[PDB]
Amino acid sequence: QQELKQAEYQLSNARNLHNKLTNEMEACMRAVQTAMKEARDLDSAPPVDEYITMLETDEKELAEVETALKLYDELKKHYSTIKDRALRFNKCYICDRDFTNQEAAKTRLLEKVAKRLGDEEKKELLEDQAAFMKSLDILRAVRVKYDTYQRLSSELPQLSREIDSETNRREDLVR
Amino acid sequence: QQELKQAEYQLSNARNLHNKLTNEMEACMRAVQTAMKEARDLDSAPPVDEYITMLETDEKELAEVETALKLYDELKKHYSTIKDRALRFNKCYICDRDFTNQEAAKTRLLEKVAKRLGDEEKKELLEDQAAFMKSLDILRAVRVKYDTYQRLSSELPQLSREIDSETNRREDLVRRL
Amino acid sequence: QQELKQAEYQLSNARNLHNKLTNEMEACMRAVQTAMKEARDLDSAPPVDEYITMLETDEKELAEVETALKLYDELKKHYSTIKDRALRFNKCYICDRDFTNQEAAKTRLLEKVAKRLGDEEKKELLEDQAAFMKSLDILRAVRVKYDTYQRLSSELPQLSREIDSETNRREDLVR
Amino acid sequence: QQELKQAEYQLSNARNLHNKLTNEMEACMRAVQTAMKEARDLDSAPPVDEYITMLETDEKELAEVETALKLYDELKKHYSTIKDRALRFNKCYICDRDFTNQEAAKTRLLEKVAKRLGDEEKKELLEDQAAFMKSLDILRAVRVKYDTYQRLSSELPQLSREIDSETNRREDLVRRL
Ligand SMILES: [Zn+2]
Ligand SMILES: [Zn+2]
């Protein structure tokens, strides 16, 4: 008799805890699926297990375009010193030979370096940086909801074992 | 009085949980503090909430040396094509003028590109990439322990206020009875 | 008269040189006026000595937009670290207070920094840097021609006076 | 032979002009070499054609410290508005939350911002701006001398060929006697 009230109370606490934890897990899954759907502009939401890959892709695809942005800048520094020493000082930067009576060789150099540094590349990979940064921010915002979804996926079966064991304890304890 | 028995049972469970959760936050705190001490080889462990600044520091200091390595490679490609067109084809790559009877200017070019080349910059950037990646991995390993320490820092005051309220009810009600 | 032959000889050389140098000055003037017309996209070419003021105009208008580009990037780092901590770590970066039960204050922070992260300004002042660099290169290309025009404007009067002195010499030396 | 004496007269003028223009080139070279020595306080004068790298490096080292000064001022403006909203209105500028019953968090904000507000960095950037502008002005003062030395290095060999032709032809015209 006396401990059956504890067995019933424990089982009731564990049932209600499992229900509440399940609801929170489902909410986190919805939120993370909504983020995955909008982050890449998907027509239907992917499986929750795909968030880790979508986040790693974004973390890398952003780092790639940011390396490429500094790459363009450092190359454009070098090509500008080539053009400047030709225009300002009548000279090829690499071999330090002047262009006196050699205006065609100077013209060829300038027409070459002008084709090394168009602006449309910078426009495009700045648009890429903007899109990958937006997408990564959307996935970073739900990181803690995926992590709670993950730990609740380990905690709910452990609690369910406790519920089933206490259910059998109750079913025995009647006599 | 079954309602007082429930009130004492409800406070028991709460006090015991605040104990279990306090022990878990404190373990999380010791784990993240030792990881912070280890990651930067510190003489004593920093405050628990310096974790975010040194994680963000390692994330960006690693990204910097990885951009610098990729930059060095691209510059080394370009300078190699300059050296190669001078050695293989007797030409300056930029202006398309040969070095026939100009061996001193060819020599100059080659000595210049040889100074825009060198092992030490890649060697020491690779050591820095290895060091920041080690430090970042040590801090990333405890990310989940920092996040639970933080969530428990919200939950313990809420649970503590709930106990205080329950304790007051237990006091007021045992006086009534 | 041997020295009258020598006089008519050097007077003639000076006269022909004054012509040659006059034609070189005029060729330089037309080149720098053409550069000034195309550099700022003018309906008519300006006076030759407007060159130095519009050159140092382009030098400083370029330096301004390049400082503003570097400024925008540094500000965008600060605003991004503020956004990042709010999204990733649920804290305000400045005061180190979390947003638990305060998601309206978190939302206010994120909306405020988003209004500090627009790329229209970068798009526009990258067009400005491209435009001022083009005009500065056009004006830099003719710098040496302008400097020759300037030195010949000192030399031609000096030589002109020489001719006239040798003309008086010749006119005196006939008898 | 009047045509031979006209050829001797032409040769004499070219020879004397080459001498005059050579003396002018050497005067230009000396001036730019002493200016390069002065601009960076060098203990021996560099080769005349290093003038372009010295001018380009002075232009960019000046321009970057002038950008750094503008950077520091805009950062100091932003940090001043953070300090001011905390001191004057008891509030965090970023999140719009007051510091009532939170004066430790207010104190942390103010101490963090005080560690950004360092005036020594402006002193050092102004010292560097002063030094690079002095250096650049020394090199800009000799710009016209270097551009002169450069045009004369094209003209003297052309005139030297003309001499070598006329010195051959004079000797041919006395062989013709
Ligand atoms: Zn070349
Ligand atoms: Zn705040």
Swiss-Prot record, chains B, D:
Recorded superkingdom: Eukaryota
Q: Which residue ranges does the record assign to the Zinc-hook domain?
A: 45-144
Q: Which residues form a coiled coil?
A: 1-75
The compartments listed are: Nucleus; Chromosome
Give the range the annotation lists for the signal sequence.
Answer: none
Residues the record lists as binding Zn(2+) = 92, 95
Function, as annotated, reads: Component of the MRN complex, which plays a central role in double-strand break (DSB) repair, DNA recombination, maintenance of telomere integrity and meiosis. The MRN complex is involved in the repair of DNA double-strand breaks (DSBs) via homologous recombination (HR), an error-free mechanism which primarily occurs during S and G2 phases. The complex (1) mediates the end resection of damaged DNA, which generates proper single-stranded DNA, a key initial steps in HR, and is (2) required for the recruitment of other repair factors and efficient activation of ATM and ATR upon DNA damage.
Question: What's the subunit arrangement here?
Answer: Component of the MRN complex composed of two heterodimers RAD50 and MRE11 associated with a single NBS1.
* Family, as annotated: Belongs to the SMC family. RAD50 subfamily.
Regarding domains, what does the record say?
The zinc-hook, which separates the large intramolecular coiled coil regions, contains 2 Cys residues that coordinate one molecule of zinc with the help of the 2 Cys residues of the zinc-hook of another RAD50 molecule, thereby forming a V-shaped homodimer. The two heads of the homodimer, which constitute the ATP-binding domain, interact with the MRE11 homodimer.
- What name is this protein filed under? DNA repair protein RAD50
* Full protein segment contained here: 600 to 776 of 1315
